[PDB]
Amino acid sequence: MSNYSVSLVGPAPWGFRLQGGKDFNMPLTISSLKDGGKAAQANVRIGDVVLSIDGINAQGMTHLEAQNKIKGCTGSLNMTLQRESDL
């Protein structure tokens, strides 16, 4: 599959929402994007799957764990994602 990395320059908001996680038995997925927000401008796309957040495998995190990891990011948000938006 096709992966990509983003390094969003703070401060937050980062301009996205997530769905999924361990507790939903589905991957962590970008579910929403603010138009002109930092994630959108970084070419993050709805449907893409979050693989890691600041180096850490996110693929087993609960939804709240992933959100907390993302909110703990000061300065820059680094994530690696898997493209799942090419239909």
Count of residues in the chain: 87
CA dihedral 54, 37, 63, 84 (to 10 degrees): -80
Q: Give the three-class secondary structure for 68.
A: helix
In angstroms, the CA 75 to CA 48 distance is 23
Taking Cα atoms as reference points, which of 27, 58, 29 lies closest to residue 45?
Answer: 29
Name the residue range of residue 39's domain. 1-87
CA angle in degrees (0–180, nearest 5) for 22-57-12 = 90
Q: CA 21, CA 50: separation in Å to the nearest integer?
A: 10
Half-sphere exposure of 26 (CA within 13 A, CB side): 10
> Looking at residue 43, which CATH number applies to its domain?
2.30.42.10
CA-to-CA distance for 19 and 29, rounded, in angstroms? Answer: 5
Please count the structural domains in the chain.
Answer: 1
Q: What would the two tokens of residue 52 be?
A: 């890691």
The residues facing 77 across adjacent strands are: 8
Which amino acid belongs to residue 55? Answer: G
